[PDB]
């Protein structure tokens, strides 16, 4: 007498809060009190639901190549899959691996706000790709499988309000959220300014500004992903002094003010 879609489900948040919390009545949606969302799905069920819902390229469909079934039936005729190792013999294998799915931050405005070339859209906001936890995008680890479930899936359960949410986004959404989720003032009162991976760049900018190449230094300034230290701006404006260029000095300082946390107020 009981027909369900899934056999079992799980809770969003754990014992410490729940065991006490249950004593306070929560107001459920009046028309549809019982909520079963995609955050309530189990491991298997979620895996399956994230496979389906992407037309061809998506892992769920059988000929996408990510199919783990060893046999598939086309109209009463059973077909046995060809293993990839054998598929390689007549069809050369070119795989760059993960890194070819990610463009640098530079291109992001050209790409309309994305670093990610994957099948699903990837939002840099917390709430669209949110499962139980807030979504975070690994720029190293991106796979076709998408373990973290951060991508925007077209057909999955509960996708609708998310898709709407995406189409409702502000003009700078992608860019702004990428910028604020990373790059924030330290709990100490210390600037984010010092980061290992970007340091040689800042060294190059300063060293270039000191020999008086302003344009070169700026062309490298463009490539900077993180807030540059005060020394950078000191070097750039000090380079700006001899040739009398005022406008460029002012725009430098104006770039450091209120945009970048006032690194340039010094």
């Amino acid at each position: 007498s009981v027909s369900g879609v899934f056999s079992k489900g799980r809770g969003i948040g754990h014992e410490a809060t729940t065991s006490i919390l249950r004593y306070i009545p929560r107001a459920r949606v009046p028309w549809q009190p019982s909520r079963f969302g995609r955050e309530n799905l189990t491991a298997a069920d979620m895996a399956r639901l994230w496979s389906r819902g992407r037309y061809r390229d998506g892992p769920g469909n059988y000929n996408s190549g990510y199919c783990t079934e060893r046999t598939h039936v086309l109209e009463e005729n059973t077909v046995s899959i060809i293993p990839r190792r054998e598929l390689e013999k007549y069809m050369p294998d070119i795989t760059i691996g993960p890194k070819a799915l990610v463009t640098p931050v530079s291109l992001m405005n050209a790409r309309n706000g994305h670093r990610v070339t994957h099948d699903l859209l990837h939002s840099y906001d917390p709430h669209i790709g949110r499962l139980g936890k807030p979504a975070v995008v690994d720029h190293d680890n991106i796979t076709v499988e998408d373990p973290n479930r951060v991508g925007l899936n077209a057909a999955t359960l509960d996708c609708r309000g998310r898709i709407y949410r995406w189409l409702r986004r502000g003009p700078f959404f992608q860019v702004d959220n990428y910028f604020r989720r990373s790059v924030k003032l330290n709990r100490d009162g210390t600037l984010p300014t010092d980061f290992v991976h970007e340091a040689p760049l800042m060294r190059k900018i300063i060293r270039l500004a000191h020999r008086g190449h302003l344009k070169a230094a700026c062309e490298e300034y463009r490539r900077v992903t993180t807030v540059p230290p005060v020394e950078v701006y000191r070097a750039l404006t000090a380079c700006c002094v001899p040739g009398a260029k005022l406008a460029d000095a002012v725009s430098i300082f104006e770039d450091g003010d209120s945009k970048l946390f006032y690194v340039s107020r010094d």
């Binding site: 306070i24 003032l185 100490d188």
Partner: protein, 315 residues
């Protein structure tokens, strides 16, 4: 007519009907609207402010004479928004060496405040001696009249808060009305750190004193960070202080209260890792927090859940 409602802006048959303006009438503006002028709403972002200092500002007033002279020693200390990584032992050794050479009370004390701050950031425990070695004699000992520079007080207090310490209770008490009266001049950050440390070491009575003081001095309650208030109210197991904390819990705002419940529920929850020292289980307090929250927020009507068991009587 359908399951899709006519959107009344686009549809002429709405627009041009007798209950709205037809196109042959003269198309002017009907009535003016001043909304933003009559009642104005103050700005509170749902996101916290981006550029705020977020720490304790130690107020460096030094004369621009010694501030040149002491530069080689000072450079190792914190300036504005800059936190040099120099080992604490070295800085304390420098002050211990040179400071008696300089004659000013103000300069030496400002210097010392900076030393305390620098040590509070690295959490070195051997700083407190500098309080007992120089300052204790003229400020906290045996009713000495001298009144300490505010920078110094704030700095030492922040040190006691960062490095968990009992000594704070003697300083705090000196700063009330009858004493130095530095209490109204504290940053919101100061109160946050204070409540956090105090809640960690687990003094219900320290907490009650401090909240009393904050309420009286008109600190900014809702802008006191949630983490610290939750930790502080977590440590409270005593019946009287518990009563005080209900009655005090009403002193917050609607939003603040909801995110107190949320912060609390995250902190013994998934976000248990967010803390350096894990919390201690307080069930009654956490519960009463979620209860206060459920009370102050607006009520939604869920008739099926309320009246689920109801039955009519012909009595």
């Amino acid at each position: 007519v359908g399951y899709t409602p006519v959107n009344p802006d686009t549809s002429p048959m709405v627009a041009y009907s007798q209950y709205h303006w037809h196109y042959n009438l003269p198309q002017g503006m009907e009535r003016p609207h001043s909304v933003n002028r009559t009642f104005a709403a103050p700005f509170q972002s749902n996101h916290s402010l981006v550029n705020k200092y977020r720490g304790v500002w130690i107020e460096f007033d030094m004369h621009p004479a010694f501030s040149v002279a002491l530069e080689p020693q000072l450079r190792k200390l914190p300036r504005g928004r800059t936190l040099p990584k120099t080992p604490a032992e070295e800085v304390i050794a420098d002050y211990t060496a040179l400071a008696p050479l300089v004659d000013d009370e103000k300069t030496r004390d400002l210097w010392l405040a900076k030393v305390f701050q620098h040590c509070a950031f690295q959490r070195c425990g051997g700083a407190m001696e500098l309080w007992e070695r120089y300052c204790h004699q003229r400020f906290t000992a045996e009713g000495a009249t001298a009144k300490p520079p505010l920078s110094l007080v704030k700095s030492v207090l922040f040190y006691c808060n960062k490095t968990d310490n009992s000594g704070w209770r003697a300083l705090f008490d000196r700063c009330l009305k009858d004493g130095w009266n530095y209490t109204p001049l504290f940053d919101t950050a100061q109160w946050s750190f204070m409540l956090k440390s105090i809640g960690r070491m687990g003094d219900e009575d320290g907490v009650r004193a401090v909240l009393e003081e904050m309420l009286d001095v008109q600190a900014d309650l809702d802008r006191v960070e949630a983490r610290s208030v939750v930790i502080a109210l977590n440590a409270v197991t005593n019946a009287d202080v518990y009563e005080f904390v209900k009655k005090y819990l009403f002193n917050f705002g609607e939003r603040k209260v909801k995110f107190l419940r949320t912060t609390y529920s995250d902190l013994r929850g998934h976000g248990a890792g967010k803390l350096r020292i894990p919390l201690k289980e307080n069930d009654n307090m956490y519960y009463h927090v979620c209860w206060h929250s459920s009370i102050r927020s607006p009520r939604q009507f869920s008739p099926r859940q309320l009246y689920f068991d109801y039955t009519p009587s012909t009595l």
